[PDB]
Amino acid sequence: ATFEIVNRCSYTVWAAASKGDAALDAGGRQLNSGESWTINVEPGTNGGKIWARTDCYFDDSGSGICKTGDCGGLLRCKRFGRPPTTLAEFSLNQYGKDYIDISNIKGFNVPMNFSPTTRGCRGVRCAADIVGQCPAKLKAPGGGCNDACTVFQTSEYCCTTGKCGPTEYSRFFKRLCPDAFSYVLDKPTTVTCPGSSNYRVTFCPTA
Numbered sequence: 001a002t003f004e005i006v007n008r009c010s011y012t013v014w015a016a017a018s019k020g021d022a023a024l025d026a027g028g029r030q031l032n033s034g035e036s037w038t039i040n041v042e043p044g045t046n047g048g049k050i051w052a053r054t055d056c057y058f059d060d061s062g063s064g065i066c067k068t069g070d071c072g073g074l075l076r077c078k079r080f081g082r083p084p085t086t087l088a089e090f091s092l093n094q095y096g097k098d099y100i101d102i103s104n105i106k107g108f109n110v111p112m113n114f115s116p117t118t119r120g121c122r123g124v125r126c127a128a129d130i131v132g133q134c135p136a137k138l139k140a141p142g143g144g145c146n147d148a149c150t151v152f153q154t155s156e157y158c159c160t161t162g163k164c165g166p167t168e169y170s171r172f173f174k175r176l177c178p179d180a181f182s183y184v185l186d187k188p189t190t191v192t193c194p195g196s197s198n199y200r201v202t203f204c205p206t207a
């Protein structure tokens, strides 16, 4: 499966791609404003995620730090990134179908469109100005808008017991981006695509 990752933001992002215990493709790369990076993701990849990282520095060896989405200080991510990170999430070739979503469960940093480039399903988008409108208590000083679980570490926000409801904080994310997951037990906004579809993740899809 191919994912074209496109940075339409006016600022540089460092794209990242991981399934939590391994990189997808090279795992990460710099994308200046306007750049595209096409990656190959192995069929059957379950629980894959793509995200943007902002304000990164890396040495010649690919070690450093990012202000949002840092993955253990690596340019080439092997693990998931530090919140806040808008997430493009996907599981591929699951009994003949692909499943895609956008999630704000680990906060929001950069707006995103996540769309198939092949036939048979729709895309999803979270392009509202979540950082600008972020509730005071969720604003990350390093940049971005944290989820409430990251900030407050309660069973209700983290849905630790498997029982949780929507919250004032989850409703904020849901208000701004109805088509993205706002908390663990949100009514799903997962799209079912044909098995072996291809995709494009666009950062800052709209002005």
Ligand SMILES: [Cl-]
Pocket (backbone or CB within 6 Å): 131, 140, 142, 143, 144
């Ligand atoms: Cl900020």
